[PDB]
Amino acid sequence: EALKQLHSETQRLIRESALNLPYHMPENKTIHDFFK
Amino acid sequence: KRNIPKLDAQRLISERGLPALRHVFDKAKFKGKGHEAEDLKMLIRHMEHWAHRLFPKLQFEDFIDRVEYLGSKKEVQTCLKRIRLDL
Amino acid sequence: NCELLATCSALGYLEGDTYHKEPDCLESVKDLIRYLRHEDETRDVRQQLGAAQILQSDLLPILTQHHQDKPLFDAVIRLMVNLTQPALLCFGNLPKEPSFRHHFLQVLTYLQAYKEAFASEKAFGVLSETLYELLQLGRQEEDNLLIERILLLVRNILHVPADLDQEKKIDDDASAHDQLLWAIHLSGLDDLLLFLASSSAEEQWSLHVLEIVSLMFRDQNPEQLAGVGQGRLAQERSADFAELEVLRQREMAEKKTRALQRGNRHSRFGGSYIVQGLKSIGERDLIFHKGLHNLRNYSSDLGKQPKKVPKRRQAARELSIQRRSALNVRLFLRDFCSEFLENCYNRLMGSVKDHLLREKAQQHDETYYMWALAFFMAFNRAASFRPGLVSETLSVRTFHFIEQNLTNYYEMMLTDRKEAASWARRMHLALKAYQELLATVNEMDISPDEAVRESSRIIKNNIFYVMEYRELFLALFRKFDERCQPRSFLRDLVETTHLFLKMLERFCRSRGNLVVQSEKEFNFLDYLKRFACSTVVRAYVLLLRSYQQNSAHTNHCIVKMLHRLAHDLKMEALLFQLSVFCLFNRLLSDPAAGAYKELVTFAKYILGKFFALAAVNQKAFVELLFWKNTAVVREM
DNA sequence: CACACACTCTCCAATTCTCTAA
């Protein structure tokens, strides 16, 4: 029963933790490099 | 005039309906394990014949589509629980 | 008619491959705009100008050869936007009376003509050169107005329904839409759309560019599109020959089955038989007239016709059939998907969600959002998968957004009777996005990165801990209707439910997951017994009817879920139905039954259980006839 | 002409909409 409470608390912490991903956005460049 | 049959619960609780369906398989026989396809063909043949005798107007699949809906009604349901077990 | 004819003919004359404009052509196009702004409700000026083909005859040459005359050019752009305006906007709604529906069809036909004409590459070349100058300049009210009207012109020309009676075109012949996309590619306006989506300086156009992209991709689906390699043409040649071979062999086999069904004697070769052991509809035995060869496989409905089911009772049907676009267009669209996913997805999708937050978007633009959320996520899943390029929409916020949109569409489908089919199509888009998010959170567990594995476990924990994502499938199955929703909706729903239950099974069998929602206890089989309902099995059987036409994955999913529900939960008697038994009879009598080993084995298993119960008592035959609630436990 | 096409017109009833009990 205490184990059940600890499971609830730990899984609350896991589900609340923020995401970590290999995020990126590539290089900015003006319209000249796109169009021609 | 306008003596068109309908296939409502009164038709289903008629003599040709569930009271007949309780008895049509008395003559039937089945092979059992490993021959379920043949037993299924005999089963559908018997109940298709019963459907044809009950209400010849419809094809068998359309009759099934009608009756599977129509069983929800209270009159045929009371007759069902009479047919189940006995009066 | 006469004044409009005089004013339109006043514009210019075409000499060979060159167009000469009269000096007052600017005032002429202004007059045409004036007439269009003072149309009748029948859209009479749009009809008359489309009949005259003034757009193709005058405005396209003026666009492609006199774009330097800027005051004429912007008026011409506005005039083309007004002419190319979609018919649903022109009339407000699809009409429901003969005269106004005819007017709608006439305007739509002229839109077909406009779309066919705009495939000329010079039009989009001029438009792309202009918009390149405008975005280099980007800034004025007139400048952003011109950008908006150019983007609306592209939207309008992309958004016409193809008249598939005339576009009755084969597997990969270039449709009008294909030619339009190829013209966009050659003009380089695709690069400008990519620039608008990737650039952070002008994000107000991100919603419009999303609309342009959503209208670009309509025939395509990402799984097929991502696999189009450079050597695909030779492969598809051999594939076409193989498909023709198997189709022809199948038809020959069907012909021989029919030939052996009937006799080898002619039709009027008479003779009649009595079947002594078979009562007719009267008291006497049946007299049979169609011959011994029809008696060999006798059915009691040989001579009957189908029933005329009424209009309000008829099932819905698919609005599209999968003609591929031309292979060059497919290569261009795959490259566009690659560049969009790499350079454009995160910023554009964040900007569009910001637009939804600011609430300046139109009343159903989240449908475009969910379209892209399905499409490009599935494109990423196909071929080399990389969550880093698509990280933004993996947030739990997107799951919540999809859930609220799907439930809203569900309620509007159940309430808004007059628009229920469109609400069903919107709910289908939301369901597809939800399915693809389930697919990607499934996919990233296979990846080698511990960080995205942590993100996956986070997402799975909160999504399975929150109940409303879990109960939505039971809601959809309980209020699914074939009369409103096509079979593709049911197919996607079954696939999504199988994937969701698979992931939930894995999560509960690898981790505790002991509580849900205010915590309350939870176990996996308790949730699975919710699906032990007559409506759910009825829908699953409804999809099972098309087992030949279903994909192999769909057959695997449907038989797996039904076998789970029958065997593990021990509720075979729920699946005992006579329609289901007719389905099994056709399945077992199929000449191609060897290709459906799992299905036929499951059918034999459930049939053996039924015949055991029937050997126990005769009540099984009567109980087999009617759908059945939790009182099925008597039979079990 | 008396036996067949084609059209109009009438009322029956088949299916859904709305209110109520389980």
CSV table of N, CA and C in Angstrom, one decimal, chain C residues 111-232:
chain,number,residue,atom,x,y,z
C,111,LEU,N,-14.0,26.8,-63.9
C,111,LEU,CA,-12.8,26.6,-63.0
C,111,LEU,C,-11.9,25.5,-63.5
C,112,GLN,N,-12.5,24.4,-64.0
C,112,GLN,CA,-11.7,23.3,-64.7
C,112,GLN,C,-10.9,23.9,-65.8
C,113,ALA,N,-11.5,24.7,-66.6
C,113,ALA,CA,-10.9,25.3,-67.8
C,113,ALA,C,-9.7,26.2,-67.3
C,114,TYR,N,-10.0,27.0,-66.3
C,114,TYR,CA,-8.9,27.9,-65.7
C,114,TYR,C,-7.7,27.1,-65.2
C,115,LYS,N,-8.0,26.0,-64.5
C,115,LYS,CA,-6.9,25.2,-64.0
C,115,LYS,C,-6.1,24.5,-65.1
C,116,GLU,N,-6.8,24.1,-66.1
C,116,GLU,CA,-6.1,23.5,-67.3
C,116,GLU,C,-5.3,24.6,-68.0
C,117,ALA,N,-5.7,25.8,-68.0
C,117,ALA,CA,-5.0,26.9,-68.7
C,117,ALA,C,-3.8,27.3,-67.9
C,118,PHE,N,-3.9,27.3,-66.6
C,118,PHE,CA,-2.8,27.8,-65.8
C,118,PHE,C,-1.6,26.9,-65.7
C,119,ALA,N,-1.7,25.7,-66.2
C,119,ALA,CA,-0.5,24.8,-66.3
C,119,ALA,C,0.6,25.3,-67.2
C,120,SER,N,0.3,26.3,-68.1
C,120,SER,CA,1.4,26.9,-68.8
C,120,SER,C,2.4,27.5,-67.8
C,121,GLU,N,3.7,27.2,-68.0
C,121,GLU,CA,4.7,27.5,-67.0
C,121,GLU,C,5.0,29.0,-66.9
C,122,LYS,N,4.7,29.8,-68.0
C,122,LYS,CA,5.1,31.2,-68.0
C,122,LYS,C,4.3,31.9,-66.9
C,123,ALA,N,3.0,31.5,-66.7
C,123,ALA,CA,2.2,32.2,-65.7
C,123,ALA,C,2.9,32.1,-64.3
C,124,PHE,N,3.2,30.9,-63.8
C,124,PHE,CA,3.8,30.8,-62.5
C,124,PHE,C,5.3,31.3,-62.6
C,125,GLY,N,5.9,31.3,-63.7
C,125,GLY,CA,7.2,32.0,-63.8
C,125,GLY,C,7.1,33.4,-63.5
C,126,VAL,N,6.2,34.1,-64.1
C,126,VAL,CA,6.0,35.6,-63.8
C,126,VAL,C,5.6,35.8,-62.4
C,127,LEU,N,4.7,34.9,-61.9
C,127,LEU,CA,4.2,35.0,-60.5
C,127,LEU,C,5.4,34.8,-59.5
C,128,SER,N,6.2,33.9,-59.8
C,128,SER,CA,7.4,33.6,-58.9
C,128,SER,C,8.4,34.7,-58.9
C,129,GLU,N,8.7,35.2,-60.1
C,129,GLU,CA,9.6,36.4,-60.3
C,129,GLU,C,9.1,37.6,-59.5
C,130,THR,N,7.8,37.9,-59.7
C,130,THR,CA,7.1,39.0,-58.9
C,130,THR,C,7.3,38.8,-57.4
C,131,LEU,N,6.8,37.6,-56.9
C,131,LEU,CA,6.8,37.4,-55.5
C,131,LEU,C,8.3,37.3,-54.9
C,132,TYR,N,9.2,36.9,-55.8
C,132,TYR,CA,10.6,37.0,-55.4
C,132,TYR,C,11.0,38.5,-55.1
C,133,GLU,N,10.6,39.3,-56.0
C,133,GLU,CA,10.9,40.8,-55.8
C,133,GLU,C,10.2,41.3,-54.6
C,134,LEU,N,8.9,40.9,-54.4
C,134,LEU,CA,8.2,41.3,-53.2
C,134,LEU,C,8.8,40.9,-51.9
C,135,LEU,N,9.3,39.7,-51.8
C,135,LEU,CA,9.9,39.1,-50.6
C,135,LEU,C,11.3,39.6,-50.4
C,136,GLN,N,12.0,40.0,-51.5
C,136,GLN,CA,13.2,40.8,-51.3
C,136,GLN,C,12.9,42.1,-50.7
C,137,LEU,N,11.8,42.8,-51.2
C,137,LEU,CA,11.5,44.1,-50.7
C,137,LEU,C,11.0,44.0,-49.2
C,138,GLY,N,10.3,42.9,-48.8
C,138,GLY,CA,9.9,42.8,-47.5
C,138,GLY,C,11.0,42.6,-46.5
C,139,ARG,N,8.4,47.3,-47.2
C,139,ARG,CA,7.1,46.7,-46.9
C,139,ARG,C,6.0,47.7,-46.8
C,140,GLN,N,4.9,47.4,-47.5
C,140,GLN,CA,3.8,48.4,-47.6
C,140,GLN,C,2.5,47.6,-47.5
C,141,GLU,N,1.4,48.4,-47.3
C,141,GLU,CA,0.1,47.7,-47.4
C,141,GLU,C,-0.2,47.2,-48.7
C,142,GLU,N,0.1,47.9,-49.8
C,142,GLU,CA,-0.1,47.4,-51.1
C,142,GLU,C,0.8,46.2,-51.4
C,143,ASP,N,2.0,46.2,-50.9
C,143,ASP,CA,2.9,45.1,-51.1
C,143,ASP,C,2.4,43.8,-50.5
C,144,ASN,N,2.0,43.8,-49.2
C,144,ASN,CA,1.5,42.6,-48.6
C,144,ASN,C,0.2,42.2,-49.2
C,145,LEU,N,-0.6,43.2,-49.6
C,145,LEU,CA,-1.8,42.9,-50.4
C,145,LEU,C,-1.5,42.1,-51.6
C,146,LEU,N,-0.5,42.5,-52.4
C,146,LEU,CA,-0.2,41.8,-53.6
C,146,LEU,C,0.3,40.4,-53.3
C,147,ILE,N,1.1,40.3,-52.2
C,147,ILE,CA,1.6,39.0,-51.8
C,147,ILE,C,0.4,38.1,-51.5
C,148,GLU,N,-0.6,38.6,-50.7
C,148,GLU,CA,-1.8,37.9,-50.4
C,148,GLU,C,-2.6,37.5,-51.6
C,149,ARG,N,-2.7,38.4,-52.6
C,149,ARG,CA,-3.5,38.0,-53.7
C,149,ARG,C,-2.8,37.0,-54.6
C,150,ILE,N,-1.5,37.1,-54.7
C,150,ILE,CA,-0.7,36.0,-55.5
C,150,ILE,C,-0.9,34.7,-54.8
C,151,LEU,N,-0.8,34.6,-53.5
C,151,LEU,CA,-0.9,33.4,-52.7
C,151,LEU,C,-2.4,32.9,-52.9
C,152,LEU,N,-3.3,33.8,-52.9
C,152,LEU,CA,-4.7,33.3,-53.0
C,152,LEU,C,-5.0,32.9,-54.5
C,153,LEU,N,-4.3,33.4,-55.5
C,153,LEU,CA,-4.4,32.9,-56.8
C,153,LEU,C,-3.9,31.5,-56.9
C,154,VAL,N,-2.7,31.3,-56.3
C,154,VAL,CA,-2.2,29.9,-56.3
C,154,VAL,C,-3.1,28.9,-55.6
C,155,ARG,N,-3.6,29.4,-54.4
C,155,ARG,CA,-4.6,28.6,-53.7
C,155,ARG,C,-5.8,28.2,-54.5
C,156,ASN,N,-6.3,29.2,-55.2
C,156,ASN,CA,-7.5,29.1,-56.0
C,156,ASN,C,-7.3,28.1,-57.2
C,157,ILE,N,-6.2,28.2,-57.9
C,157,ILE,CA,-5.9,27.3,-59.0
C,157,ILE,C,-5.6,25.9,-58.5
C,158,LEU,N,-5.0,25.8,-57.3
C,158,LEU,CA,-4.8,24.4,-56.8
C,158,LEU,C,-6.1,23.8,-56.3
C,159,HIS,N,-7.0,24.6,-55.7
C,159,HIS,CA,-8.2,24.2,-55.2
C,159,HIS,C,-9.4,24.3,-56.2
C,160,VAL,N,-9.5,23.3,-57.0
C,160,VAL,CA,-10.7,23.0,-57.8
C,160,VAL,C,-10.8,21.5,-57.7
C,161,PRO,N,-12.1,20.9,-57.6
C,161,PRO,CA,-12.2,19.5,-57.8
C,161,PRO,C,-12.0,19.1,-59.2
C,162,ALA,N,-11.2,18.0,-59.5
C,162,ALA,CA,-11.0,17.6,-60.8
C,162,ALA,C,-12.2,16.9,-61.3
C,163,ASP,N,-12.7,17.2,-62.5
C,163,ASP,CA,-13.8,16.6,-63.2
C,163,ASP,C,-13.4,15.3,-63.8
C,164,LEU,N,-13.4,14.3,-62.9
C,164,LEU,CA,-12.9,12.9,-63.2
C,164,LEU,C,-13.7,12.2,-64.3
C,165,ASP,N,-14.8,12.8,-64.8
C,165,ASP,CA,-15.4,12.2,-66.0
C,165,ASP,C,-14.5,12.6,-67.2
C,166,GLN,N,-14.0,13.8,-67.3
C,166,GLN,CA,-13.0,14.2,-68.3
C,166,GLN,C,-11.6,13.8,-67.9
C,167,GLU,N,-11.3,14.0,-66.6
C,167,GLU,CA,-10.0,13.4,-66.0
C,167,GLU,C,-10.2,12.0,-65.6
C,168,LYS,N,-10.6,11.1,-66.6
C,168,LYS,CA,-10.9,9.7,-66.4
C,168,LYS,C,-9.6,9.0,-66.7
C,169,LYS,N,-8.5,9.4,-66.0
C,169,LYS,CA,-7.1,9.1,-66.5
C,169,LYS,C,-6.5,8.0,-65.6
C,170,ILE,N,-5.6,7.2,-66.3
C,170,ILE,CA,-5.1,5.9,-65.8
C,170,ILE,C,-3.9,6.2,-64.8
C,171,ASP,N,-3.4,5.0,-64.3
C,171,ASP,CA,-2.6,4.9,-63.1
C,171,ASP,C,-1.6,6.0,-62.8
C,172,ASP,N,-0.8,6.4,-63.8
C,172,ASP,CA,0.2,7.5,-63.6
C,172,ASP,C,0.3,8.4,-64.9
C,173,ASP,N,-0.8,8.5,-65.6
C,173,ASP,CA,-0.9,9.6,-66.6
C,173,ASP,C,-1.1,10.9,-65.9
C,174,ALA,N,-0.4,11.9,-66.4
C,174,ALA,CA,-0.4,13.3,-65.8
C,174,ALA,C,-1.7,13.9,-65.8
C,175,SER,N,-2.4,14.1,-64.7
C,175,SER,CA,-3.6,14.8,-64.6
C,175,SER,C,-3.3,16.3,-64.7
C,176,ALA,N,-4.4,17.1,-64.8
C,176,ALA,CA,-4.3,18.5,-64.7
C,176,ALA,C,-3.6,19.0,-63.5
C,177,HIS,N,-3.9,18.4,-62.3
C,177,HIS,CA,-3.2,18.7,-61.1
C,177,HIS,C,-1.7,18.4,-61.2
C,178,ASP,N,-1.4,17.2,-61.8
C,178,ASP,CA,0.0,16.9,-62.0
C,178,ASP,C,0.7,17.9,-62.9
C,179,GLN,N,0.1,18.4,-64.0
C,179,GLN,CA,0.7,19.4,-64.8
C,179,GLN,C,0.9,20.7,-64.1
C,180,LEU,N,-0.1,21.1,-63.3
C,180,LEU,CA,0.0,22.3,-62.5
C,180,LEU,C,1.1,22.2,-61.5
C,181,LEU,N,1.3,21.1,-60.8
C,181,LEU,CA,2.4,20.9,-59.9
C,181,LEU,C,3.8,20.9,-60.6
C,182,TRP,N,3.8,20.3,-61.8
C,182,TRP,CA,5.1,20.4,-62.6
C,182,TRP,C,5.4,21.8,-63.0
C,183,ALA,N,4.4,22.6,-63.4
C,183,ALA,CA,4.6,24.0,-63.7
C,183,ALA,C,5.1,24.7,-62.5
C,184,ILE,N,4.5,24.5,-61.3
C,184,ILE,CA,5.0,25.1,-60.1
C,184,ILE,C,6.5,24.7,-59.9
C,185,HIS,N,6.8,23.5,-60.1
C,185,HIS,CA,8.2,23.0,-59.9
C,185,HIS,C,9.2,23.8,-60.9
C,186,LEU,N,8.8,23.8,-62.2
C,186,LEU,CA,9.6,24.4,-63.2
C,186,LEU,C,9.8,25.9,-63.0
C,187,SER,N,8.7,26.6,-62.6
C,187,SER,CA,8.8,28.0,-62.3
C,187,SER,C,9.5,28.3,-61.0
C,188,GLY,N,9.8,27.3,-60.1
C,188,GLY,CA,10.5,27.6,-58.9
C,188,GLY,C,9.7,28.2,-57.8
C,189,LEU,N,8.4,28.3,-57.9
C,189,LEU,CA,7.6,28.8,-56.8
C,189,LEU,C,7.6,27.9,-55.6
C,190,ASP,N,7.9,26.6,-55.8
C,190,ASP,CA,8.0,25.7,-54.7
C,190,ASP,C,9.1,26.2,-53.8
C,191,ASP,N,10.2,26.7,-54.4
C,191,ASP,CA,11.3,27.2,-53.6
C,191,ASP,C,10.9,28.5,-52.8
C,192,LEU,N,10.0,29.3,-53.4
C,192,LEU,CA,9.5,30.4,-52.6
C,192,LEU,C,8.5,30.0,-51.5
C,193,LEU,N,7.7,28.9,-51.7
C,193,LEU,CA,6.9,28.4,-50.6
C,193,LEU,C,7.8,27.8,-49.5
C,194,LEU,N,8.9,27.2,-49.9
C,194,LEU,CA,9.8,26.7,-48.9
C,194,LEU,C,10.5,27.8,-48.1
C,195,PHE,N,10.8,28.9,-48.8
C,195,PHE,CA,11.4,30.1,-48.2
C,195,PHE,C,10.4,30.7,-47.2
C,196,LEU,N,9.1,30.8,-47.6
C,196,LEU,CA,8.1,31.4,-46.7
C,196,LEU,C,7.9,30.5,-45.5
C,197,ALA,N,8.0,29.2,-45.6
C,197,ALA,CA,7.8,28.3,-44.5
C,197,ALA,C,9.0,28.3,-43.6
C,198,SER,N,10.2,28.3,-44.1
C,198,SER,CA,11.4,28.3,-43.4
C,198,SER,C,11.8,29.6,-42.7
C,199,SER,N,11.4,30.7,-43.3
C,199,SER,CA,11.8,32.0,-42.8
C,199,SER,C,10.9,32.4,-41.6
C,200,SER,N,11.6,33.1,-40.7
C,200,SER,CA,10.9,33.6,-39.5
C,200,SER,C,10.4,35.0,-39.6
C,201,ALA,N,10.7,35.7,-40.7
C,201,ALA,CA,10.5,37.1,-40.8
C,201,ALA,C,9.0,37.5,-41.2
C,202,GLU,N,8.3,36.5,-41.9
C,202,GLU,CA,7.0,36.8,-42.4
C,202,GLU,C,6.1,35.6,-42.1
C,203,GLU,N,6.0,35.3,-40.8
C,203,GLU,CA,5.3,34.1,-40.4
C,203,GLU,C,3.8,34.2,-40.6
C,204,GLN,N,3.2,35.4,-40.8
C,204,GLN,CA,1.8,35.6,-41.1
C,204,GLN,C,1.3,34.8,-42.3
C,205,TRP,N,2.2,34.6,-43.3
C,205,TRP,CA,1.9,33.8,-44.4
C,205,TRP,C,2.0,32.3,-44.2
C,206,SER,N,2.4,31.9,-43.0
C,206,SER,CA,2.7,30.4,-42.8
C,206,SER,C,1.4,29.6,-42.9
C,207,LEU,N,0.3,30.2,-42.4
C,207,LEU,CA,-1.0,29.6,-42.5
C,207,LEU,C,-1.4,29.4,-44.0
C,208,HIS,N,-1.2,30.5,-44.8
C,208,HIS,CA,-1.5,30.4,-46.2
C,208,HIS,C,-0.6,29.3,-46.9
C,209,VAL,N,0.6,29.3,-46.6
C,209,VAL,CA,1.6,28.4,-47.2
C,209,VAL,C,1.2,26.9,-46.8
C,210,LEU,N,0.7,26.7,-45.6
C,210,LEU,CA,0.2,25.4,-45.2
C,210,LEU,C,-1.0,25.0,-46.0
C,211,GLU,N,-1.9,26.0,-46.3
C,211,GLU,CA,-3.0,25.7,-47.2
C,211,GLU,C,-2.5,25.3,-48.6
C,212,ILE,N,-1.5,26.0,-49.1
C,212,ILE,CA,-1.0,25.7,-50.5
C,212,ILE,C,-0.4,24.3,-50.5
C,213,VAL,N,0.4,24.0,-49.4
C,213,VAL,CA,1.0,22.6,-49.4
C,213,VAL,C,-0.1,21.6,-49.3
C,214,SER,N,-1.1,21.8,-48.5
C,214,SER,CA,-2.2,20.8,-48.3
C,214,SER,C,-3.0,20.6,-49.6
C,215,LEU,N,-3.1,21.7,-50.4
C,215,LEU,CA,-3.7,21.5,-51.7
C,215,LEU,C,-2.8,20.9,-52.7
C,216,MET,N,-1.5,21.1,-52.6
C,216,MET,CA,-0.5,20.4,-53.5
C,216,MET,C,-0.7,18.9,-53.4
C,217,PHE,N,-0.7,18.3,-52.2
C,217,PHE,CA,-0.7,16.9,-51.9
C,217,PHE,C,-2.2,16.5,-51.7
C,218,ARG,N,-2.8,15.9,-52.7
C,218,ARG,CA,-4.1,15.3,-52.5
C,218,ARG,C,-4.3,13.9,-53.0
C,219,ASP,N,-3.7,13.5,-54.1
C,219,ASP,CA,-3.7,12.1,-54.5
C,219,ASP,C,-2.7,11.2,-53.7
C,220,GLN,N,-1.7,11.8,-53.2
C,220,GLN,CA,-0.5,11.1,-52.7
C,220,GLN,C,-0.8,10.7,-51.2
C,221,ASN,N,-0.1,9.6,-50.8
C,221,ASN,CA,0.0,9.3,-49.4
C,221,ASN,C,1.5,9.1,-49.1
C,222,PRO,N,1.9,9.4,-47.8
C,222,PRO,CA,3.4,9.5,-47.6
C,222,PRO,C,4.1,8.2,-47.7
C,223,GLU,N,3.5,7.0,-47.4
C,223,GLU,CA,4.2,5.8,-47.4
C,223,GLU,C,4.6,5.4,-48.8
C,224,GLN,N,3.8,5.6,-49.8
C,224,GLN,CA,4.1,5.4,-51.2
C,224,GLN,C,5.1,6.4,-51.7
C,225,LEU,N,4.9,7.7,-51.2
C,225,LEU,CA,5.7,8.8,-51.8
C,225,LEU,C,7.1,8.7,-51.4
C,226,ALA,N,7.4,8.3,-50.1
C,226,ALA,CA,8.7,8.3,-49.6
C,226,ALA,C,9.6,7.2,-50.3
C,227,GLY,N,9.0,6.2,-50.8
C,227,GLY,CA,9.7,5.1,-51.4
C,227,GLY,C,10.0,5.2,-52.9
C,228,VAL,N,9.7,6.4,-53.5
C,228,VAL,CA,9.9,6.6,-54.9
C,228,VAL,C,11.4,6.9,-55.2
C,229,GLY,N,12.2,5.8,-55.4
C,229,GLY,CA,13.6,6.0,-55.7
C,229,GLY,C,13.8,6.3,-57.2
C,230,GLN,N,15.0,6.6,-57.6
C,230,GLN,CA,15.3,7.0,-59.0
C,230,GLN,C,15.1,5.8,-59.9
C,231,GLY,N,15.1,4.6,-59.5
C,231,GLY,CA,15.0,3.4,-60.3
C,231,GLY,C,13.6,2.8,-60.3
C,232,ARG,N,12.6,3.6,-59.9
C,232,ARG,CA,11.2,3.1,-59.6
C,232,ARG,C,10.5,2.8,-60.9
